[PDB]
Design an enzyme around this catalytic site. Structure first.
Site, PDB file in Angstrom:
ATOM      1  N   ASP A 193      41.061  -9.605 -47.997  1.00  0.00           N
ATOM      2  CA  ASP A 193      41.926  -9.252 -46.878  1.00  0.00           C
ATOM      3  C   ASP A 193      41.373  -8.118 -46.021  1.00  0.00           C
ATOM      4  O   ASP A 193      42.109  -7.506 -45.246  1.00  0.00           O
ATOM      5  CB  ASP A 193      43.324  -8.873 -47.389  1.00  0.00           C
ATOM      6  N   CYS A 209      38.665  -5.684 -49.541  1.00  0.00           N
ATOM      7  CA  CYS A 209      38.034  -6.155 -50.782  1.00  0.00           C
ATOM      8  C   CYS A 209      37.130  -5.157 -51.488  1.00  0.00           C
ATOM      9  O   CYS A 209      36.941  -5.253 -52.701  1.00  0.00           O
ATOM     10  CB  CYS A 209      37.276  -7.478 -50.556  1.00  0.00           C
ATOM     11  N   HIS A 224      31.900 -10.391 -48.645  1.00  0.00           N
ATOM     12  CA  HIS A 224      32.976 -10.187 -49.609  1.00  0.00           C
ATOM     13  C   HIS A 224      32.548  -9.383 -50.849  1.00  0.00           C
ATOM     14  O   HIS A 224      31.456  -9.585 -51.370  1.00  0.00           O
ATOM     15  CB  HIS A 224      33.520 -11.563 -50.021  1.00  0.00           C
TER      16      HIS A 224
END
Length: 352
Positions: free
Chosen positions: A98, A101, A246
């Site tokens: 979101d 991370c 990510h």
């Protein structure tokens, strides 16, 4: 359907709340000059339980649930993760992407809970707003222009461009610049984070980007809490994994084998062993970097397999901490009890 939670903290959300509650209270918020930092929770480390003790069909049920199979495969496939056969295996836990991370990843590594309450995300922003960032701004401008020994504009402007970086650390929402709930964080933020935690962070990133089109964000590397003395810091790293864009925690496995808890400080490059990049170092430090590592980390030498030919090379590896979370705040045990039970109920069930 087979109700085995997607995250370790769901096995007992009440306990998760206890953890998320003690966290902000453990933050030292010196309004004097030094950065905000934790008093004791940063010393916590969690480890995943061994699933190789369960039936195969079931072992997969667990892995599909808790592990980010995508990043796992990716980083392992390019021999960037678990390539070393003399050290324990690291596993990637799923983490909400979101835009926060990095905090969710870091928070899970030591606590088992994500930065759901934005405590870490908030600590970062507070530090960049109510603390002296003269040394941070400095090291930032330096490595921006690029000035090191293990790596490779307009007319006056290094206060407003820096300003923004402080905005990204905020809990504010982007105008769907990519479609996430929070703003994305970069290198410098990771560095400030390891200082707030007074614990080094080591990011294992994906290099496989022959198809990249950034005209790139070189996140991989070692982040040491240089704003503190190695004596006042924890000598065990927080290992994170990183792919396209990510973060995920790379927690060590709990039991099996005589291999040691350590993370090689080099990359299995193309035939050679390249040293890992150590972020935001100054000309001076950069010279003595191997010293600083031995100082802020518990460096050890490990005889690793050579390059597929009976040869063996000696490499540097940082020792990885062992699970130290007290039962009352240990979510891996509760999740383990869940799988232990659904399992006995899986054996009696598989009687069909």
């Amino acid at each position: 359907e087979q109700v085995l939670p997607q995250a370790l903290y769901l096995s007992n959300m009440r306990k998760a709340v206890k953890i998320r509650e003690r966290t902000p209270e453990d933050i030292f918020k010196p309004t004097n000059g030094i950065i905000h930092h934790f008093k004791t929770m940063h010393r916590y480390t969690l480890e995943m339980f061994r699933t190789c003790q369960f039936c195969p069909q079931f072992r997969e049920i667990i892995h599909k649930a808790l592990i980010d199979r995508n990043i796992q495969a990716t980083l392992e496939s390019q021999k960037k993760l678990n390539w070393c056969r003399e050290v324990r295996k690291l596993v990637a836990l799923k983490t909400n992407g979101d835009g926060n991370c990095l905090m969710h990843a870091t928070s899970q590594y030591m606590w088992g809970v994500q930065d759901t309450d934005l405590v870490l995300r908030k600590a970062l922003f507070s530090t960049l707003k109510e603390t002296d960032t003269r040394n941070f701004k400095f090291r930032w401008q330096l490595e921006s222009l690029k000035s090191q020994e293990f790596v490779e504009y307009d007319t006056r402007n290094w206060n407003d461009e820096w300003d923004n970086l402080i905005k990204m650390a905020s809990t504010d929402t982007p105008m769907a610049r990519s479609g996430l709930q929070y703003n994305s964080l970069e290198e410098i933020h990771i560095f400030v984070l390891c200082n707030i935690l007074r614990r080094p962070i080591i990011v294992i990133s994906d290099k496989m980007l022959r198809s990249l089109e950034s005209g790139p964000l070189k996140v991989g590397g070692i982040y040491l809490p240089l704003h503190w003395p190695a004596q006042e810091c924890y000598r065990y790293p927080i290992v994170l994994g990183y792919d396209s864009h990510h973060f995920v925690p790379l927690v060590t496995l709990k039991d099996s084998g005589p291999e040691i808890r350590a993370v090689p400080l080099v990359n299995r490059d193309r035939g050679r062993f390249e040293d890992l990049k150590v972020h935001f170092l100054t000309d001076p430090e950069n010279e003595m970097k191997e010293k600083l590592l031995k100082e802020y980390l518990m460096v050890i030498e490990i005889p690793v397999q050579g390059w597929d030919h009976g040869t063996t090379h000696l490499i540097n590896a940082a020792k990885l901490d062992e699970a130290n979370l007290p039962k009352e705040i240990n979510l891996v045990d509760d999740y383990f009890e869940l799988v232990q039970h659904e399992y006995k109920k899986w054996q009696e069930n598989s009687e069909q």
